[PDB]
Design a binder for these strands. Sequence first.
DNA 1: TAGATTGTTAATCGATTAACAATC
DNA 2: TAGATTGTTAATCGATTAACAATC
Lengths: 217, 217
Amino acid sequence: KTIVSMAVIRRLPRYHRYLEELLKNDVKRISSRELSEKMGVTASQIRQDLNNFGGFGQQGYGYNVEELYNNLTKILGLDKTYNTIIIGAGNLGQAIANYTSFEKSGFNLKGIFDINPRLFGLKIRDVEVMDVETVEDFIARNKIDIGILCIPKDNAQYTADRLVRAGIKAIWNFLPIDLKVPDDVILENVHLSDSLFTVSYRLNEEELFKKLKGETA
Amino acid sequence: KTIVSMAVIRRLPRYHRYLEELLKNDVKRISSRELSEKMGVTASQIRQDLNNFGGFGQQGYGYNVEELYNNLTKILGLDKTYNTIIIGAGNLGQAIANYTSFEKSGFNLKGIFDINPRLFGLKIRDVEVMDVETVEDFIARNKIDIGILCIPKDNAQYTADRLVRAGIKAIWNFLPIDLKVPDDVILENVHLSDSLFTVSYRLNEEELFKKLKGETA
DNA sequence: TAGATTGTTAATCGATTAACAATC
DNA sequence: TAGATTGTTAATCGATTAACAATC
Ligand SMILES: NC(=O)c1ccc[n+]([C@@H]2O[C@H](COP(=O)([O-])OP(=O)([O-])OC[C@H]3O[C@@H](n4cnc5c(N)[nH+]cnc54)[C@H](O)[C@@H]3O)[C@@H](O)[C@H]2O)c1
Ligand SMILES: NC(=O)c1ccc[n+]([C@@H]2O[C@H](COP(=O)([O-])OP(=O)([O-])OC[C@H]3O[C@@H](n4cnc5c(N)[nH+]cnc54)[C@H](O)[C@@H]3O)[C@@H](O)[C@H]2O)c1
């Protein structure tokens, strides 16, 4: 359980995103008026959400883009730095390993790990792939903050444990399993496996209620 | 805006997943009682959610795993078939293209597209990479249901449009951009670029309110 | 200044939980 | 059958919206 309501927290990187578009375009200031306009949210929510972390607004003025942006940056914690590792140098593994946008925002890939020894030594974007046996130790030596999980779901909770045990601070989970972690570990589930299904679901939904509303009268 | 509340819809793939674990272990039946136990949700919510699509339950008995599972299948619309294409044969592109579990559940890769001709013809898991010029057409000839977007964000709304125009039914969106689609197009955003930030945010949150609760008294 | 727009509290809306009568 | 567990309605909780007095 976190201090701010999660519904809100999930909307923060979104503000961060739009605010930076405005900053990038030399727009000097914006009002929640115009922002909710632009983001298709309610002007209340915006003022509402923001006023969990204080007033960045100025009556009569609106919000100074540069100053609010720079503040969301600090709120999302992106003024700091995060050492990350990837477990599972697979397809997804490597695609995530190659992607560098994350770096810009503070997240530095320190290591990649796999069981399959063919891969040991292999270098992706200049981080070498290492035996996942040594992970528990490497985490401890290198103050690893986030572990990115891209190994097959099978018996993976075991590996998740070894991570937690070794003092990993949060896990980013790409497997289609709900993992079990301690209270002091942030688990972020992705679950494409699911997200996709809400699409197949939405596509069929409208016809699925002729299938069920043709069941009473 | 959809018939069932979204909050619910997003939990459906989750039930589906659990139910299938049970089915896999020959467990003949389960009660919302034991399920909310196993899933760490409230027994009401389960019964609650499910009774949007009818009573698969039996008083005194609970839920027949097999029959409930098979019904979630039908609800999530995983009893039909979906033609999918991928735009952008990059890292993520190919990673998603190579992943075959999606097929098992109804989703069939019919094509992959790129602008860079250096890829044209190249075959991934036996679909060959084609010029994204031809996509508008290929969508129409092959009744493509979902387009998976894995192109760089820059100017992508243009490409998005082309897809919509050609009558794609939904887009699965992996770019860190909010796209604009018509009412009759299902847009599913992924936004790893965000989800990750809720982790850096959570890591710094507890200290961020010492930084702000040391600001009044 | 005075018109504009925020911080913030109050009213509404939706989603979760709890309760219980119906029933297998 | 009778103990168990659902379908469903009612009570609670949380999140979104609306409103307005404070203030730049
Ligand atoms: N790839 C996708 O498009 C996609 C979509 C949804 C979910 N996933 C999940 O992503 C994870 C991997 O998918 P992928 O990268 O396409 O599969 P992959 O390419 O087979 O990756 C598996 C990698 O993990 C390695 N490995 C296996 N076990 C371990 C272990 N215990 N410790 C360290 N390394 C290990 C294995 O050698 C291989 O390199 C799986 O859990 C999928 O279920 C992937
Ligand atoms: N890879 C990740 O780890 C990751 C994480 C978060 C977001 N993303 C997003 O995923 C998308 C692609 O990432 P990636 O695949 O790693 O980059 P990539 O590996 O450079 O893939 C880009 C591919 O798309 C092709 N392309 C460019 N423009 C077009 C176009 N207009 N139509 C069709 N194809 C085009 C391009 O030639 C290349 O093959 C980008 O939108 C990223 O922002 C990726």
